[PDB]
C-alpha cells in the first residue's frame, strides 16, 4: 500500500498564487519500491517537473497562472495517501 505510511510536505499544495511556483514532497522511504500516481484537473495549465529519488520522496513543482483550486489526486499504488485529494486555492499574481 505505501499510502498507509506516506509523509508529505506541501508549501504550495494547500495554497498557491498565480505567477508563483508551488511544490510538495512524498517522503515514503518506508514504502520503498512502488511508483505513485499524481495528476491535476481544472480549466487551466501548469508546468510540471518531477524527479525520481532513491529516497522514494517524489519532488515535483509547478507554476500556474489562472486562479482557481486544482484537484490534486495523490494515490500510492492506486490507493489513497493521507488526504489524497488536495485542492490548492490559487490567487492572482501581481498584475
Amino acid at each position: 500500500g505505501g499510502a498507509h505510511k506516506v509523509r508529505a510536505g506541501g508549501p504550495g499544495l494547500e495554497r498557491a498564487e498565480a505567477g508563483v511556483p508551488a511544490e510538495f514532497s512524498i517522503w515514503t522511504r518506508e514504502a520503498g519500491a512502488g511508483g505513485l500516481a499524481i495528476a491535476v484537473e481544472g480549466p487551466s495549465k501548469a508546468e510540471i517537473s518531477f524527479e525520481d529519488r532513491k529516497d522514494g520522496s517524489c519532488g515535483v513543482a509547478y507554476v500556474v497562472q489562472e486562479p482557481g483550486d486544482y484537484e490534486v489526486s495523490v494515490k500510492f499504488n492506486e490507493e489513497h495517501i493521507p488526504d489524497s485529494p488536495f485542492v490548492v486555492p490559487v490567487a492572482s499574481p501581481s498584475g
Binding site: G2, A31, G32, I38, A39, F50, K54
Partner: peptide, 21 residues
C-alpha cells in the same frame, strides 16, 4: 484539462541476502 506523471520508488544500493551460505 487533464495531465500528470507516474513515478517509480526504489531503494538506493542493493543488499546482501541472508547469510544462507
Amino acid at each position: 484539462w487533464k495531465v500528470g506523471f507516474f513515478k517509480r520508488n526504489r531503494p538506493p544500493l542493493e543488499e546482501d541476502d541472508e547469510e544462507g551460505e
